Amino acid sequence: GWTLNSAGYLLGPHAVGK
């Protein structure tokens, strides 16, 4: 992502990171 997918939405299809 860039703003809505990186800063707005969370990423992690296989690897988790909180």
Describe it.
- This is Galanin.
- It comes from Homo sapiens.
- The PDB classes it as neuropeptide.
- By secondary structure, the chain is largely without helices or strands.
- The chain contains no helices and no strands.
- The radius of gyration is 8 Å and the shape is elongated.
- The termini are far apart.
Give the key terms.
about 20 residues; little secondary structure; elongated
Structure at a glance:
The protein is largely without helices or strands.
Task: Label the overall shape.
Answer: elongated
As a percent range, the share of helical residues equals: under 10%
What does the radius of gyration come to? 8 Å
> Largest sheet, described in full?
none
PDB class: neuropeptide
Keywords: binding epitope, synthetic peptide, neuropeptide
Assembly: monomeric
Entry title: NMR Solution Structure of hGal(1-12)KK, a solubility-tagged truncation of the human neuropeptide galanin
Fold topology:
Blueprint: no helix or strand
Protein name: Galanin
